Amino acid sequence: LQEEERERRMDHAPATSDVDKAIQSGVSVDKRTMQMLQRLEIGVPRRVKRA
Amino acid sequence: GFFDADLSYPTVRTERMKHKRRRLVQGPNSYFMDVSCPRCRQVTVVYSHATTSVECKGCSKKLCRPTGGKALLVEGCGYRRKPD
Amino acid sequence: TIGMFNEEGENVDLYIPRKCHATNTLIEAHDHAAVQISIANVGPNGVINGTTTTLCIAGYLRSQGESDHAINHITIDRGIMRIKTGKP
Amino acid sequence: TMMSVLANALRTIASAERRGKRQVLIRPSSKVVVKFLQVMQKHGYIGEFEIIDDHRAGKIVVNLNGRLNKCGAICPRFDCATTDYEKWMKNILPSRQFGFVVLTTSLGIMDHEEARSRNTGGKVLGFFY
Amino acid sequence: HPRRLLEGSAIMRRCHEYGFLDEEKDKLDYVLSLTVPDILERRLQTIVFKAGLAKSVHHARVL
Amino acid sequence: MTAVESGSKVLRMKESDAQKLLAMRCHIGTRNQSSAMKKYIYGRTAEGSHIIDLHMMWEKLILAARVIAAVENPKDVCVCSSRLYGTRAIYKFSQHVGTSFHGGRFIPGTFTNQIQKKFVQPRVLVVTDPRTDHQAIREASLVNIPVIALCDTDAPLEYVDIAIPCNNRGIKSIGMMYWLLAREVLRLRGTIVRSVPWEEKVDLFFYRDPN
Amino acid sequence: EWVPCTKLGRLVKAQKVTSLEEIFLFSMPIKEHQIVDTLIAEGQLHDEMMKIYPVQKATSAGQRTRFKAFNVVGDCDGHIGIGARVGKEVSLAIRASMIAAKLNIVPVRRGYWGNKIGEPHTIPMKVTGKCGSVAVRLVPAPRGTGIVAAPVPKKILEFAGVEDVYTSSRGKTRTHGNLIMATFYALRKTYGFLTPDLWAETEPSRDPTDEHAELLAEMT
RNA sequence: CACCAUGUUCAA
RNA sequence: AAGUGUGGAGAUCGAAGAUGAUUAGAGACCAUUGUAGUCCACACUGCAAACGAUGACACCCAUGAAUUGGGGAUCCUUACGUAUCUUUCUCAGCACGUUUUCUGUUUUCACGCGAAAGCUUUGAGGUUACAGUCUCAGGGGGGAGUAC
RNA sequence: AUGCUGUUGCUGUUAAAGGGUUCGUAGUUGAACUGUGGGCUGUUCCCGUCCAUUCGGAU
Ligand SMILES: *O[C@H]1[C@H](O)[C@@H](N)[C@@H](O[C@H]2[C@H](O[C@@H]3O[C@H](CO)[C@@H](O[C@H]4O[C@@H](CN)[C@@H](O)[C@H](O)[C@H]4N)[C@H]3O)[C@@H](O)[C@H](N)C[C@@H]2N)O[C@@H]1CO
Ligand SMILES: [Mg+2]
Ligand SMILES: [Mg+2]
Ligand SMILES: [Mg+2]
């Protein structure tokens, strides 16, 4: 019952996801990663940086 | 990944690394170059691994120096590699 | 038409066994690492169909570490998994 | 030093086939070792193979299809009369049903089954099954 | 082959002649299936018991 | 496995999908490198970390999903994690997809000791790590269970059939690979549709230190 | 009664898996000896004890003694199984080897020496099997040869359905623990050798636990 | 780091 | 290595031997010595656990740290990544870093093998599915490496 | 019986056994190549022009 209570208190998420708050500042990839993302069939994604 | 090695038609990355006799067909590493003398300026053909010390036939000077591998050309000389 | 016959054309042996799709190795009855993997054939809208592509791998090939290289080589041949990106 | 080039080639095929490879690189090659492989193609134990030209002895890249269990070379090349085929089948072959003993005869390099039909004898080269 | 047509038709002949194989068995693979009681049934001690001329098989060997 | 029989582009990675992978750092490998995962590396970055090819990540991700979606009775998939960072993600993948799940010490004999009362017989094992789940994999070698694994750059790939390359180390990186696989298996089944985004937040897949 | 625990024994008890070669096809471990005597008919399955010998463990204050019993099982139509268990009483280890020999049941490929005319009289190729140093080699024999073997391999080869065979044995055959299990390893290899009959491509099937997954969930 | 050698014959 | 011959040398350690001591005895260990020897020259010997208790020459053979010398770069993909610090003369230098590759001495690691211990591109693997070439030795323990 | 004489067919790290190392004759073994021909006739997707902007669409 303390395990059934704290399993309900833990399964709670904010309205904005931690991934949606991560894109909204920019993902800021590395040199090698950005040099890879030119090669893809989708190109370099939007909301990106090069650091 | 996702491309498998074909032993008949190996990758340029795989094949450039290999020893010259460990290639699929063995071949040279060396080449010829057209060396211009530092004074005197006349062109000479110098082998890349010239263990002898080649002389300028016009200048009378020696524009190469043997090493353990590739021979070292003198300072101030111009050279471009010849094909084949 | 697989397995030995009689000269009267009746299939004499019991149990024609499976063969590895990577190494063509006949899978024995005690080879308890030998697995079948069913991959869902999927349609144009990205939802699975009622048909699956099944590929079976021998037990020694999983034992060494070389099964994952073999599942790649099969699914490129079957056309299941793409070999490279398209051009940008 | 390398003594028998055919015994070298069949040993590298048999070794790479028990390892389950997809291709072998055979070095050096001969006219004998390609005539041995073309016996192994006709009864479908190997796939397509390719002879690379050096101005040396060549190299052969053989595509394996999983069907070969063991190929080997009998050294020295013992002389085999026509009455001696059933003796060589019981010694080096696993069964009378499958498996071939390759011989070099006057008519060519053939397996044991063809040479029995053409009523010829030869020196034994090797086997494949 | 000459040694199988001759001399393979001799061994099938003596099986049919002495009662080792009935006349349906003609393929030569039935000689490989003969047993020791298949031969012992053809002794005169056995037929004189089987034809009915004696009460027991030890009556037949006496007579 | 983003190649369908007709030839559509329905399964392929999109600029929204790959933007999530870059944000959650699930393409950064560790410093070390093994032979079997060497084909999945694109290149090495400065500070010596390995970068994983996002094509081969996505092709092995969808290939593992085309295997999980082709399982009627989804309880025959068992997904398991001995490392602590996985256990919350293992629970939420099991909730949306409907698979068995196990966390913590594996308790040997779960797959082989048949008179135990914790005896299960899955058809597909999904391990979070090939290394910390060595015991789950080694019993799958005994009772004919193929293995799906989230492999890092140095992974022992004996008995692993579909090795997914990712970053299984960090808390956000793990769970993003379970969100995206749960997001995908539900698409292949037809539960959710591919047009609208899957509303369910990734945050519940993340492990959170309850003390 | 017999309540099964494994999914294979649930399907054998429900007659969903009907024959024993449906288990051999998918490389499944048996794990329950009631599977075998259900699938094989009861009168067409013979067993008898190969060897019983005592093995001792030196302890403080004397020796511990347990008897190691060998059993062989199989109808004489291509199924063979050998199991070796141990026990304090000789009656327990004989009973435990019966349980063990059915779990190790395995098929025997049989073939022809010369022409093919009926049921196979012999093994289809030369095969050896090695346990310890004792390796026995089994060679195909002609149609009316018989089993030419030592009386410990000969009793195993009778239960495996092989009617005519040549046999060699290379080293320390008076150790019957390894002589028994080397005849078993050699007959087990008869479905391991890829012959040009089996070169053809066969269409894949579905596991009995794949196909009947909806029925097995109804036992829970 | 003083000295500290040995226990008849078979059998259980 | 010991040993031998003829010359040198002769410091130290030191078979033999001598004294102490320990011990039931001590012909031993321990302490003090001390001859031949140790060391060199020129001859002789040819006796090792002279070992990896593993004959030589080729072939194939999975993986990850290193190390020594030389060389080179900074539906099976048409190619690509470079730092550090010493520098008025055996100095167009030296060392390092990342990566190739040849040769050598190895190490924890896939098959396979072995009675096992273990071996494993450095085979003891590629072997009853037994043939690349040559060579030497063995055939229960002794007597006996003895006698002639 | 004895693959305990081994050509088939034995062993040699530890069970008996690789000889201290090189050179070396008799001996045995020894790399590739000069070629086996030809003619006729039988035998639904995806790639763009209209919508939308960290996730779509008719085509
Ligand atoms: O000849 C070499 C061979 O061509 C190559 N296969 C290589 O194998 C490895 C390589 O292993 C060695 O790692 C050593 C460094 O720790 C390196 O040695 C080298 O060191 C450099 C710096 N001193 C050189 O200057 C030096 O000349 C060179 N000996 C390598 O040899 C690894 O580095 C690779 N990561 C993987 C390769 N497979 O080894 C052969 C000689 O061992
Ligand atoms: Mg006394
Ligand atoms: Mg004292
Ligand atoms: Mg002194």
Side-chain angles (χ1 to χ4, degrees), chain D residues 1 4-5 19 24 30 32 42-45 47 50 56 60 67 80 93 96-97 109-110 116 118 120 126:
Chain D
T1 53
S4 181
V5 176
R19 297 184 293 117
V24 310
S30 180
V32 179
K42 186 181 91 277
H43 311 288
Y45 282 87
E50 193 178 8
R56 270 71 56 183
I60 307 171
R67 292 176 187 172
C80 177
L93 296 178
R96 296 184 69 205
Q97 267 66 235
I109 287 174
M110 301 184 293
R116 190 184 295 118
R118 302 180 71 183
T120 187

PDB file of all heavy atoms in Angstrom, chain D residues 1 4-5 19 24 30 32 42-45 47-48 50 56 60 67 80 93 96-97 109-110 116 118 120 126, unseen atoms left out:
ATOM      1  N   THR D   1      59.188 -25.150 -47.956  1.00  0.00           N
ATOM      2  CA  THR D   1      58.677 -24.562 -49.176  1.00  0.00           C
ATOM      3  C   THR D   1      57.392 -25.236 -49.605  1.00  0.00           C
ATOM      4  O   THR D   1      57.052 -26.302 -49.116  1.00  0.00           O
ATOM      5  CB  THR D   1      59.713 -24.644 -50.287  1.00  0.00           C
ATOM      6  OG1 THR D   1      60.151 -25.994 -50.433  1.00  0.00           O
ATOM      7  CG2 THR D   1      60.903 -23.791 -49.948  1.00  0.00           C
ATOM      8  N   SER D   4      53.159 -29.003 -53.098  1.00  0.00           N
ATOM      9  CA  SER D   4      51.993 -29.306 -53.909  1.00  0.00           C
ATOM     10  C   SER D   4      51.050 -28.116 -53.842  1.00  0.00           C
ATOM     11  O   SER D   4      50.596 -27.737 -52.760  1.00  0.00           O
ATOM     12  CB  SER D   4      51.331 -30.589 -53.426  1.00  0.00           C
ATOM     13  OG  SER D   4      50.209 -30.929 -54.215  1.00  0.00           O
ATOM     14  N   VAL D   5      50.787 -27.514 -55.000  1.00  0.00           N
ATOM     15  CA  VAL D   5      49.930 -26.339 -55.089  1.00  0.00           C
ATOM     16  C   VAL D   5      48.461 -26.742 -55.042  1.00  0.00           C
ATOM     17  O   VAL D   5      47.621 -26.014 -54.502  1.00  0.00           O
ATOM     18  CB  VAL D   5      50.292 -25.561 -56.365  1.00  0.00           C
ATOM     19  CG1 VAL D   5      49.403 -24.387 -56.587  1.00  0.00           C
ATOM     20  CG2 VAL D   5      51.703 -25.091 -56.259  1.00  0.00           C
ATOM     21  N   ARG D  19      34.775 -23.116 -41.500  1.00  0.00           N
ATOM     22  CA  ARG D  19      34.532 -21.860 -40.818  1.00  0.00           C
ATOM     23  C   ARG D  19      33.309 -21.140 -41.356  1.00  0.00           C
ATOM     24  O   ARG D  19      32.934 -20.101 -40.816  1.00  0.00           O
ATOM     25  CB  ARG D  19      35.755 -20.962 -40.945  1.00  0.00           C
ATOM     26  CG  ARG D  19      36.962 -21.560 -40.285  1.00  0.00           C
ATOM     27  CD  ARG D  19      38.148 -20.636 -40.318  1.00  0.00           C
ATOM     28  NE  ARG D  19      38.669 -20.421 -41.661  1.00  0.00           N
ATOM     29  CZ  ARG D  19      38.680 -19.242 -42.267  1.00  0.00           C
ATOM     30  NH1 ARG D  19      38.211 -18.172 -41.644  1.00  0.00           N
ATOM     31  NH2 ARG D  19      39.177 -19.126 -43.487  1.00  0.00           N
ATOM     32  N   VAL D  24      36.838 -17.564 -50.549  1.00  0.00           N
ATOM     33  CA  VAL D  24      38.224 -17.865 -50.203  1.00  0.00           C
ATOM     34  C   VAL D  24      39.106 -17.122 -51.188  1.00  0.00           C
ATOM     35  O   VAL D  24      38.655 -16.737 -52.267  1.00  0.00           O
ATOM     36  CB  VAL D  24      38.556 -19.375 -50.247  1.00  0.00           C
ATOM     37  CG1 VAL D  24      37.579 -20.140 -49.510  1.00  0.00           C
ATOM     38  CG2 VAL D  24      38.560 -19.897 -51.630  1.00  0.00           C
ATOM     39  N   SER D  30      46.941 -22.970 -60.495  1.00  0.00           N
ATOM     40  CA  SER D  30      47.508 -23.707 -61.604  1.00  0.00           C
ATOM     41  C   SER D  30      46.411 -24.021 -62.602  1.00  0.00           C
ATOM     42  O   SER D  30      45.251 -23.668 -62.412  1.00  0.00           O
ATOM     43  CB  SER D  30      48.176 -24.993 -61.132  1.00  0.00           C
ATOM     44  OG  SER D  30      48.724 -25.699 -62.224  1.00  0.00           O
ATOM     45  N   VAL D  32      45.887 -27.137 -63.017  1.00  0.00           N
ATOM     46  CA  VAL D  32      45.341 -28.296 -62.327  1.00  0.00           C
ATOM     47  C   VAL D  32      44.293 -27.869 -61.317  1.00  0.00           C
ATOM     48  O   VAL D  32      43.264 -28.532 -61.154  1.00  0.00           O
ATOM     49  CB  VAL D  32      46.477 -29.092 -61.665  1.00  0.00           C
ATOM     50  CG1 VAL D  32      45.948 -30.274 -60.931  1.00  0.00           C
ATOM     51  CG2 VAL D  32      47.449 -29.546 -62.703  1.00  0.00           C
ATOM     52  N   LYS D  42      30.570 -28.486 -61.522  1.00  0.00           N
ATOM     53  CA  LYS D  42      29.646 -29.262 -62.338  1.00  0.00           C
ATOM     54  C   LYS D  42      28.691 -30.070 -61.474  1.00  0.00           C
ATOM     55  O   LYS D  42      27.494 -30.152 -61.766  1.00  0.00           O
ATOM     56  CB  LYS D  42      30.447 -30.173 -63.258  1.00  0.00           C
ATOM     57  CG  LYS D  42      29.636 -30.948 -64.268  1.00  0.00           C
ATOM     58  CD  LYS D  42      30.528 -31.846 -65.104  1.00  0.00           C
ATOM     59  CE  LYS D  42      30.643 -33.216 -64.466  1.00  0.00           C
ATOM     60  NZ  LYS D  42      31.676 -33.265 -63.406  1.00  0.00           N
ATOM     61  N   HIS D  43      29.200 -30.664 -60.410  1.00  0.00           N
ATOM     62  CA  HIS D  43      28.387 -31.168 -59.319  1.00  0.00           C
ATOM     63  C   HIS D  43      28.407 -30.093 -58.253  1.00  0.00           C
ATOM     64  O   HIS D  43      29.446 -29.869 -57.649  1.00  0.00           O
ATOM     65  CB  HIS D  43      28.976 -32.459 -58.769  1.00  0.00           C
ATOM     66  CG  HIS D  43      29.309 -33.464 -59.820  1.00  0.00           C
ATOM     67  ND1 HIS D  43      28.347 -34.166 -60.506  1.00  0.00           N
ATOM     68  CD2 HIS D  43      30.500 -33.893 -60.293  1.00  0.00           C
ATOM     69  CE1 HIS D  43      28.931 -34.979 -61.365  1.00  0.00           C
ATOM     70  NE2 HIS D  43      30.237 -34.831 -61.255  1.00  0.00           N
ATOM     71  N   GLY D  44      27.275 -29.464 -57.982  1.00  0.00           N
ATOM     72  CA  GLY D  44      27.305 -28.099 -57.484  1.00  0.00           C
ATOM     73  C   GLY D  44      27.839 -27.827 -56.093  1.00  0.00           C
ATOM     74  O   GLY D  44      27.138 -27.256 -55.265  1.00  0.00           O
ATOM     75  N   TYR D  45      29.102 -28.183 -55.845  1.00  0.00           N
ATOM     76  CA  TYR D  45      29.696 -28.026 -54.520  1.00  0.00           C
ATOM     77  C   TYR D  45      30.279 -26.638 -54.288  1.00  0.00           C
ATOM     78  O   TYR D  45      30.359 -26.199 -53.139  1.00  0.00           O
ATOM     79  CB  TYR D  45      30.756 -29.099 -54.300  1.00  0.00           C
ATOM     80  CG  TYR D  45      30.176 -30.447 -53.966  1.00  0.00           C
ATOM     81  CD1 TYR D  45      29.812 -31.323 -54.955  1.00  0.00           C
ATOM     82  CD2 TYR D  45      29.927 -30.809 -52.661  1.00  0.00           C
ATOM     83  CE1 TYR D  45      29.268 -32.528 -54.672  1.00  0.00           C
ATOM     84  CE2 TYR D  45      29.388 -32.029 -52.365  1.00  0.00           C
ATOM     85  CZ  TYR D  45      29.045 -32.875 -53.379  1.00  0.00           C
ATOM     86  OH  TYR D  45      28.500 -34.101 -53.114  1.00  0.00           O
ATOM     87  N   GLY D  47      30.461 -22.401 -56.118  1.00  0.00           N
ATOM     88  CA  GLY D  47      29.800 -21.479 -57.016  1.00  0.00           C
ATOM     89  C   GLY D  47      30.719 -20.988 -58.114  1.00  0.00           C
ATOM     90  O   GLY D  47      31.579 -21.707 -58.616  1.00  0.00           O
ATOM     91  N   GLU D  48      30.512 -19.737 -58.508  1.00  0.00           N
ATOM     92  CA  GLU D  48      31.387 -19.130 -59.500  1.00  0.00           C
ATOM     93  C   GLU D  48      32.716 -18.763 -58.868  1.00  0.00           C
ATOM     94  O   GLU D  48      32.763 -18.268 -57.747  1.00  0.00           O
ATOM     95  CB  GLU D  48      30.733 -17.888 -60.096  1.00  0.00           C
ATOM     96  N   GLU D  50      36.748 -16.917 -59.732  1.00  0.00           N
ATOM     97  CA  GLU D  50      37.331 -15.912 -60.597  1.00  0.00           C
ATOM     98  C   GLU D  50      38.841 -15.970 -60.502  1.00  0.00           C
ATOM     99  O   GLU D  50      39.397 -15.913 -59.409  1.00  0.00           O
ATOM    100  CB  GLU D  50      36.849 -14.545 -60.195  1.00  0.00           C
ATOM    101  CG  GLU D  50      37.117 -13.451 -61.169  1.00  0.00           C
ATOM    102  CD  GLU D  50      36.553 -12.156 -60.673  1.00  0.00           C
ATOM    103  OE1 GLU D  50      36.115 -12.134 -59.515  1.00  0.00           O
ATOM    104  OE2 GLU D  50      36.491 -11.175 -61.435  1.00  0.00           O
ATOM    105  N   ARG D  56      52.402 -13.229 -62.630  1.00  0.00           N
ATOM    106  CA  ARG D  56      52.813 -14.346 -61.802  1.00  0.00           C
ATOM    107  C   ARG D  56      51.859 -15.517 -62.030  1.00  0.00           C
ATOM    108  O   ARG D  56      51.095 -15.537 -62.996  1.00  0.00           O
ATOM    109  CB  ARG D  56      52.778 -13.907 -60.342  1.00  0.00           C
ATOM    110  CG  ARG D  56      54.002 -13.303 -59.749  1.00  0.00           C
ATOM    111  CD  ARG D  56      54.416 -11.915 -60.172  1.00  0.00           C
ATOM    112  NE  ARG D  56      53.435 -10.869 -59.998  1.00  0.00           N
ATOM    113  CZ  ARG D  56      53.647  -9.625 -60.391  1.00  0.00           C
ATOM    114  NH1 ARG D  56      54.808  -9.298 -60.890  1.00  0.00           N
ATOM    115  NH2 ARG D  56      52.720  -8.703 -60.250  1.00  0.00           N
ATOM    116  N   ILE D  60      42.818 -17.149 -57.196  1.00  0.00           N
ATOM    117  CA  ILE D  60      41.442 -17.543 -57.465  1.00  0.00           C
ATOM    118  C   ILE D  60      40.592 -17.117 -56.287  1.00  0.00           C
ATOM    119  O   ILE D  60      40.927 -17.433 -55.146  1.00  0.00           O
ATOM    120  CB  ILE D  60      41.288 -19.056 -57.663  1.00  0.00           C
ATOM    121  CG1 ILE D  60      42.223 -19.605 -58.712  1.00  0.00           C
ATOM    122  CG2 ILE D  60      39.920 -19.359 -58.145  1.00  0.00           C
ATOM    123  CD1 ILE D  60      42.195 -21.087 -58.722  1.00  0.00           C
ATOM    124  N   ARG D  67      27.712 -26.126 -49.473  1.00  0.00           N
ATOM    125  CA  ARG D  67      27.390 -27.513 -49.777  1.00  0.00           C
ATOM    126  C   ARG D  67      28.576 -28.439 -49.572  1.00  0.00           C
ATOM    127  O   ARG D  67      28.395 -29.643 -49.385  1.00  0.00           O
ATOM    128  CB  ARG D  67      26.874 -27.603 -51.202  1.00  0.00           C
ATOM    129  CG  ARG D  67      25.553 -26.945 -51.353  1.00  0.00           C
ATOM    130  CD  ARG D  67      25.104 -26.943 -52.766  1.00  0.00           C
ATOM    131  NE  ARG D  67      23.906 -26.154 -52.942  1.00  0.00           N
ATOM    132  CZ  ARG D  67      23.383 -25.869 -54.120  1.00  0.00           C
ATOM    133  NH1 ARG D  67      23.954 -26.322 -55.217  1.00  0.00           N
ATOM    134  NH2 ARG D  67      22.297 -25.124 -54.198  1.00  0.00           N
ATOM    135  N   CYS D  80      45.649 -45.661 -60.206  1.00  0.00           N
ATOM    136  CA  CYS D  80      44.385 -46.317 -59.918  1.00  0.00           C
ATOM    137  C   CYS D  80      43.875 -46.991 -61.180  1.00  0.00           C
ATOM    138  O   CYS D  80      43.552 -46.315 -62.158  1.00  0.00           O
ATOM    139  CB  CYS D  80      43.364 -45.311 -59.400  1.00  0.00           C
ATOM    140  SG  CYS D  80      41.754 -46.013 -59.088  1.00  0.00           S
ATOM    141  N   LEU D  93      35.748 -42.081 -49.202  1.00  0.00           N
ATOM    142  CA  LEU D  93      34.442 -41.464 -49.320  1.00  0.00           C
ATOM    143  C   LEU D  93      33.545 -41.894 -48.176  1.00  0.00           C
ATOM    144  O   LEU D  93      33.692 -43.010 -47.672  1.00  0.00           O
ATOM    145  CB  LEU D  93      33.768 -41.834 -50.636  1.00  0.00           C
ATOM    146  CG  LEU D  93      34.456 -41.345 -51.888  1.00  0.00           C
ATOM    147  CD1 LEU D  93      33.679 -41.833 -53.057  1.00  0.00           C
ATOM    148  CD2 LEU D  93      34.542 -39.859 -51.895  1.00  0.00           C
ATOM    149  N   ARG D  96      28.732 -44.630 -50.678  1.00  0.00           N
ATOM    150  CA  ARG D  96      28.705 -44.904 -52.105  1.00  0.00           C
ATOM    151  C   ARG D  96      27.686 -44.028 -52.821  1.00  0.00           C
ATOM    152  O   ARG D  96      27.713 -43.919 -54.050  1.00  0.00           O
ATOM    153  CB  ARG D  96      28.395 -46.372 -52.355  1.00  0.00           C
ATOM    154  CG  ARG D  96      29.426 -47.353 -51.840  1.00  0.00           C
ATOM    155  CD  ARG D  96      28.993 -48.713 -52.278  1.00  0.00           C
ATOM    156  NE  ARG D  96      29.137 -48.824 -53.716  1.00  0.00           N
ATOM    157  CZ  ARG D  96      28.440 -49.652 -54.475  1.00  0.00           C
ATOM    158  NH1 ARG D  96      27.510 -50.410 -53.938  1.00  0.00           N
ATOM    159  NH2 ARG D  96      28.637 -49.688 -55.778  1.00  0.00           N
ATOM    160  N   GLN D  97      26.758 -43.420 -52.078  1.00  0.00           N
ATOM    161  CA  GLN D  97      25.748 -42.567 -52.699  1.00  0.00           C
ATOM    162  C   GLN D  97      26.328 -41.265 -53.219  1.00  0.00           C
ATOM    163  O   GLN D  97      26.137 -40.921 -54.388  1.00  0.00           O
ATOM    164  CB  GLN D  97      24.625 -42.256 -51.721  1.00  0.00           C
ATOM    165  CG  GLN D  97      23.444 -43.176 -51.780  1.00  0.00           C
ATOM    166  CD  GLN D  97      23.759 -44.552 -51.356  1.00  0.00           C
ATOM    167  OE1 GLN D  97      23.517 -45.507 -52.089  1.00  0.00           O
ATOM    168  NE2 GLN D  97      24.319 -44.683 -50.170  1.00  0.00           N
ATOM    169  N   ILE D 109      41.047 -34.558 -66.486  1.00  0.00           N
ATOM    170  CA  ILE D 109      40.816 -34.606 -65.051  1.00  0.00           C
ATOM    171  C   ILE D 109      39.323 -34.768 -64.840  1.00  0.00           C
ATOM    172  O   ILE D 109      38.529 -33.902 -65.215  1.00  0.00           O
ATOM    173  CB  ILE D 109      41.372 -33.368 -64.339  1.00  0.00           C
ATOM    174  CG1 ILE D 109      42.892 -33.447 -64.296  1.00  0.00           C
ATOM    175  CG2 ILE D 109      40.826 -33.236 -62.952  1.00  0.00           C
ATOM    176  CD1 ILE D 109      43.547 -32.244 -63.751  1.00  0.00           C
ATOM    177  N   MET D 110      38.942 -35.905 -64.274  1.00  0.00           N
ATOM    178  CA  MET D 110      37.556 -36.306 -64.146  1.00  0.00           C
ATOM    179  C   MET D 110      37.345 -36.799 -62.734  1.00  0.00           C
ATOM    180  O   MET D 110      38.299 -37.051 -62.008  1.00  0.00           O
ATOM    181  CB  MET D 110      37.206 -37.428 -65.119  1.00  0.00           C
ATOM    182  CG  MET D 110      37.415 -37.080 -66.560  1.00  0.00           C
ATOM    183  SD  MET D 110      36.894 -38.365 -67.679  1.00  0.00           S
ATOM    184  CE  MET D 110      38.086 -39.586 -67.272  1.00  0.00           C
ATOM    185  N   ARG D 116      34.755 -44.277 -64.483  1.00  0.00           N
ATOM    186  CA  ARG D 116      34.286 -45.657 -64.509  1.00  0.00           C
ATOM    187  C   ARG D 116      33.435 -45.908 -65.746  1.00  0.00           C
ATOM    188  O   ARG D 116      33.468 -46.999 -66.323  1.00  0.00           O
ATOM    189  CB  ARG D 116      33.501 -45.981 -63.238  1.00  0.00           C
ATOM    190  CG  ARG D 116      33.186 -47.448 -63.097  1.00  0.00           C
ATOM    191  CD  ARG D 116      32.320 -47.785 -61.903  1.00  0.00           C
ATOM    192  NE  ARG D 116      32.965 -47.527 -60.625  1.00  0.00           N
ATOM    193  CZ  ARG D 116      32.508 -46.658 -59.730  1.00  0.00           C
ATOM    194  NH1 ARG D 116      31.399 -45.976 -59.977  1.00  0.00           N
ATOM    195  NH2 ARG D 116      33.152 -46.484 -58.586  1.00  0.00           N
ATOM    196  N   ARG D 118      33.664 -44.325 -68.730  1.00  0.00           N
ATOM    197  CA  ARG D 118      34.450 -44.281 -69.950  1.00  0.00           C
ATOM    198  C   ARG D 118      35.537 -45.337 -69.978  1.00  0.00           C
ATOM    199  O   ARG D 118      36.333 -45.347 -70.918  1.00  0.00           O
ATOM    200  CB  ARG D 118      35.063 -42.897 -70.132  1.00  0.00           C
ATOM    201  CG  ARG D 118      34.016 -41.814 -70.181  1.00  0.00           C
ATOM    202  CD  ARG D 118      34.590 -40.431 -70.364  1.00  0.00           C
ATOM    203  NE  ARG D 118      35.120 -40.253 -71.703  1.00  0.00           N
ATOM    204  CZ  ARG D 118      35.734 -39.160 -72.127  1.00  0.00           C
ATOM    205  NH1 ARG D 118      35.909 -38.130 -71.316  1.00  0.00           N
ATOM    206  NH2 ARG D 118      36.175 -39.103 -73.372  1.00  0.00           N
ATOM    207  N   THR D 120      38.291 -45.993 -68.034  1.00  0.00           N
ATOM    208  CA  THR D 120      39.646 -45.485 -68.008  1.00  0.00           C
ATOM    209  C   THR D 120      40.174 -45.508 -66.589  1.00  0.00           C
ATOM    210  O   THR D 120      39.433 -45.704 -65.627  1.00  0.00           O
ATOM    211  CB  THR D 120      39.737 -44.073 -68.579  1.00  0.00           C
ATOM    212  OG1 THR D 120      41.109 -43.691 -68.689  1.00  0.00           O
ATOM    213  CG2 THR D 120      39.042 -43.112 -67.690  1.00  0.00           C
ATOM    214  N   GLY D 126      42.392 -36.073 -55.783  1.00  0.00           N
ATOM    215  CA  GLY D 126      41.752 -35.613 -54.571  1.00  0.00           C
ATOM    216  C   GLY D 126      40.302 -36.022 -54.560  1.00  0.00           C
ATOM    217  O   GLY D 126      39.848 -36.808 -55.388  1.00  0.00           O
TER     218      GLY D 126
END
